Structure 1
């Protein structure tokens, strides 16, 4: 709806595909702990639906 879902940064190892996919605005640079991760994280569509 309003989130940025593709992004561009410094070049990837393969020059023909330099896109990062971002569902729900989540950044994939960091590792996650599945037990307690999304405690206080929301995005626009989910909040509007609620």
Structure 2
């Protein structure tokens, strides 16, 4: 929701697969040189869910999720790194089929 999931960069070793997947808008480089403080990591859908949970009178659950958010984002950063580095092969799905 309102986030760039697929982007493109310099040409790929395998010519048919040129895409980079970034779940939650987070980058694998963020584990090395972050652009925000620890309290500042967020993305649109998760913050909207926290706001809705607070508006519904469920505050303890919202606090639990607010504490759990950095773990969630680090997990998705590791998944992004695995997808973009380890799994690059000729057996990957071509870009046009992925788009269709």
TM-score, with normalisation over the residues of structure 1? 0.70
Of 2-11 and 21-30, deviating more is 21-30
**Deviation for aligned residue 1:28:** 1.8
- The change in CA–CA distance for 1:18 and 1:2 in structure 2 (over 3 A counts) is same
Structure 1 residues 36 and 4: alpha-carbon distance in aligned structure 2, compared to 1, 3 A threshold: closer
After TM superposition, the score normalised by the length of structure 2 is 0.38
Report the structure, 1 or 2, having the larger helix content.
Answer: 2
CA, structure 1 residues 25+19, in 2 after alignment: closer, same or farther (shift >3 Å)? same
- Measured at CA, do residues 25 and 13 of structure 1 come closer, stay the same or move farther in structure 2, by a change above 3 Å? same
- TM-aligned CA deviation for residue 29 of structure 1: 3.4
Say what the alpha-carbon RMSD is for the aligned residues: 3.4
Residue segments in structure 1 that go unaligned for 5+ positions in a row:
none
State the 1:38 CA deviation. Answer: 5.4
- 1:30-49 deviation per Cα after TM superposition (whole angstroms, max 9, x unaligned): 545999995421000001xx
Query: Which segments of structure 1 move beyond 3 Å, counting only runs of 4 or more?
Result: 29-39
- Structure 1 29/11 Cα, relative in aligned 2: closer, same or farther at 3 Å? farther
**Per-residue CA distance 1:4-47 (angstroms, 9 max, x = gap):** 00001111111100100010111123545999995421000001
